[PDB]
Design a protein around this ligand. Structure first.
Ligand SMILES: [Zn+2]
Length: 238
């Protein structure tokens, strides 16, 4: 059911990552795909969905492929009108898409999960929900800040992205060469008592695989924005 807290020895240490921390920072520093009321237009593999989504800013892509945990999830959202929000990558992003006139199999950008039904998923009076993030540095709550979302059921991915974007800016969570923190995990606590956490640091070694890291979001896990509680736990060292 609930996921047990990290054992001391299982959390990734920034000390053991000899690659460039900027590759991790890239995924969260004002970086995300956002789309409203779209419907998939194609598939590549059985568990993914392809959408016609182009970025106004920079014009880096016109097609987005999102991979889900399995075929049932893909099937569930295939013909649904959804909203999209997630962290995209280009390295090792593959797909032969159903490209309209202007393009030919436009394999532009990739991501995982990040899908929520549009209909009935928004607050009345067009209000935004504020979600509080409490951050602990070396076991002490140093700061707390709020992120906002207009979705009632929001992906954990969306809140994680917003939380890290703020921390990168205010706490230098990730820098180009390294990070001022040794370990770090973001923990979600749901209203029914269920808990889960994501390790915020890259796996040991000299290489960082963006697609491998973001794959954790393929479960398309959603939480109730009005009741979730989020805690960021960081230890200093680096
Ligand atoms: Zn919507």
């Amino acid at each position: 059911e609930s996921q047990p807290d990290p054992t001391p020895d299982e959390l990734h240490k920034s000390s053991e990552f000899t690659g460039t921390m900027g590759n991790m920072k890239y995924l969260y520093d004002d970086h995300y795909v956002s789309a409203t009321k779209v419907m998939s237009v194609d598939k590549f593999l059985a568990h993914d969905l392809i959408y016609n989504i182009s970025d106004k800013k920079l014009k880096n892509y016109d097609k987005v492929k999102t991979e889900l945990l399995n075929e049932d999830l893909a099937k569930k959202y295939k013909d649904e009108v959804v909203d999209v929000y997630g962290s995209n990558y280009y390295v090792n992003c593959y797909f032969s898409s159903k490209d309209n006139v202007g393009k030919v199999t436009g394999g532009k950008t990739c991501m995982y999960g990040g899908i929520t039904k549009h209909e009935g998923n928004h607050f009345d009076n067009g209000n935004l929900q504020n979600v509080l993030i409490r951050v602990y540095e070396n076991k002490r709550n140093t700061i707390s800040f709020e992120v906002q979302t207009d979705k009632k059921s929001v992906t954990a991915q969306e809140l994680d992205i917003k939380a890290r974007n703020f921390l990168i800016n205010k706490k230098n969570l990730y820098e180009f060469n390294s990070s001022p923190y040794e370990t770090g995990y973001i923990k979600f606590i749901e209203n029914n008592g269920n808990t889960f956490w994501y390790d915020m640091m890259p796996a040991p070694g000299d290489k960082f695989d963006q697609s491998k890291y973001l794959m954790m979001y393929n479960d398309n896990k959603t939480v109730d924005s009005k009741s979730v509680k989020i805690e960021v736990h960081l230890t200093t060292k680096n």
